[PDB]
């Protein structure tokens with residue numbers, strides 16, 4: 090596979106736009122969205138060339154580790170052209186004000202909003218997003234050799250995407266560093282988010298959705 | 309100012325190794341925990357001094373300096389540990405006389421998990437043949453990536469620019485330079501994971517009353 | 533509840 | 544307190 094045709098495979102793997110068709114209301118809307126998105130995330134993963142050639146254990150471990158980070162990366166990309174807004178879905182657009190209405194959510198909104206603004210400032214391109222979202226899954230903390238090859242391939246594709254911008258070799262290096270540094274900011278917001286959701290689950294104040302419940306219990 | 313001058317400044321700024329004696333008796337929960345936290349408290353003093361020597365750090369808002377160090381200290385400690393451990397496979401070189409295997413992990417409930425992560429990430433750095441000058445740039449990047457906001461961006465770009473310069477002096481192709489930079493930076497999220505697990509572990513040990521009164525460590529821990 | 537494995541193994 | 548002391552008065 091050329092880097093170009095790997096990137097087109099990620100373009101083809103992109104899940105559909107998910108709508109919620111829907112205080113307690115905001116939080117029910119987020120958990121319901123996450124449960125539907127998790128169904129589409131599994132189909133996405135399986136369309137990444139080589140992913141289904143990994144051991145089932147490895148497939149399961151990578152999605153268990155990375156699912157919240159992959160959801161938040163998708164949220165940041167949908168929000169990028171909508172300053173002050175988190176485009177959870179066309180029918181679930183939220184600002185920090187709506188966030189204030191549930192304890193601990195303000196912090197998470199004002200973190201997702203910040204990282205989104207960094208991506209906005211770097212002018213993150215769609216093909217860059219495709220590559221980093223796949224890298225988040227594949228880099229999450231016979232099969233092990235296949236995983237290293239697959240991660241190497243997506244990394245090679247991101248380098249190619251940056252090369253296509255036509256900026257200097259120096260500026261290609263700086264941009265690659267800048268993008269990959271934002272990854273630890275996605276993983277940070279992911280950690281704060283997973284803590285807040287586990288806490289909401291332990292208090293049973295958010296509805297127990299089967300796929301989301303199973304993905305949260307992994308952690 | 310130049311990338312080479314920034315790398316020479318970091319090299320000179322490297323902390324001296326903190327000396328801690330292995331306990332006389334075989335490790336207990338209490339003796340391992342006393343050993344590791346005494347080391348961290350002493351390294352934290354040297355870390356603050358190292359941070360002040362990064363060009364531009366002391367020009368940040370005091371409140372930014374504090375937030376960067378409260379956010380990153382355990383990752384900075386772990387990156388130092390992995391570097392000290394890179395020439396010694398199977399071993400975690402916490403200090404010259406504090407050389408721990410998966411074995412000694414047994415002495416503290418949950419610590420073996422942390423040692424495994426540290427040993428595995430150390431292996432990745434070893435396979436990549438991490439170089440001294442690369443390590444120096446990556447350790448400063450961990451701190452800085454954890455009007456003051458514009459300065460921080462500028463200071464992080466200067467360090468990034470130095471890491472790019474260090475990889476260029478290796479003389480590999482432009483494509484291979486990009487891949488090496490990607491491979492190093494993607495290891496940062498793994499250092500940070502080991503940091504999150506280690507911090508949660510340490511906070512739980514503080515709850516069990518196994519942790520001693522080390523004022524700086526306690527402060528840094530309560531920042532979480 | 534093994535919906536992750538179910539979805540990984542079917543389309 | 545100790546962090547601020549080490550940053551500013553050391």
Ligand SMILES: N#C[C@@H](Cc1ccc(O)cc1Cl)c1ccc(O)cc1
Nearest residue numbers: 119120123160161164282285286289
């Ligand atoms: N915001 C938010 C979400 C994270 C998220 C990101 C992207 C999505 O597409 C869907 C969600 Cl739920 C969240 C849910 C529960 C919780 O306790 C804390 C945060």
Ligand SMILES: N#C[C@@H](Cc1ccc(O)cc1Cl)c1ccc(O)cc1
Nearest residue numbers: 344345348385386389506509510513
């Ligand atoms: N591993 C480890 C240490 C952290 C550490 C890292 C690097 C260092 O150079 C020095 C230390 Cl103490 C640790 C301490 C307490 C605890 O509950 C869990 C882990």
